[PDB]
Amino acid sequence: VNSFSGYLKLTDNVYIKNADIVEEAKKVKPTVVVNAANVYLKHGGGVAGALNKATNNAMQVESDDYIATNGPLKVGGSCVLSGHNLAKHCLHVVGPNVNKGEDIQLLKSAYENFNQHEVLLAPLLSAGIFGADPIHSLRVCVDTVRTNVYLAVFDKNLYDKLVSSFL
């Protein structure tokens, strides 16, 4: 038993809710919240901009030190950093950004990072400003993640479409 509430169950291990991941994180305080990161950990907009703003920019400060030490992530890769006031940990995962021409096949590699964590609160990778089809992203999630994932979908309209079209 865990504290996630109001989710629709899609499969044995994948759950979905119309929710603001920031508000969901502040209420649940999950062990892991997933950020929709880029390779530079520049949290300017989308999910990343919203999560960073909710930490009063502490996520960005920590991220800049990480990059100065380690260099950029790989597309499809991840790193674990603090969850600040939102979660114990933040798993920064880089899905491919279609608006940069990155290979959509890397979406499966991005979701594989979730399997290193038993339970996660997450957005749909490569959705939103990353330019992928959220329905494809949901399919890859279900077919790749084996650990327990709670997906927060900000837009009510997209949420309804994802549920109604789910196979």
Ligand SMILES: O=C(O)CC[C@@H]1CN(c2ncnc3[nH]c4cc(F)ccc4c23)CCO1
């Ligand atoms: O941008 C991509 O491709 C990655 C996928 C994201 C998912 N994302 C969100 N998911 C869940 N909660 C969210 N709260 C937000 C508050 C904001 F100010 C902006 C975005 C979100 C947001 C919406 C945009 O797409």
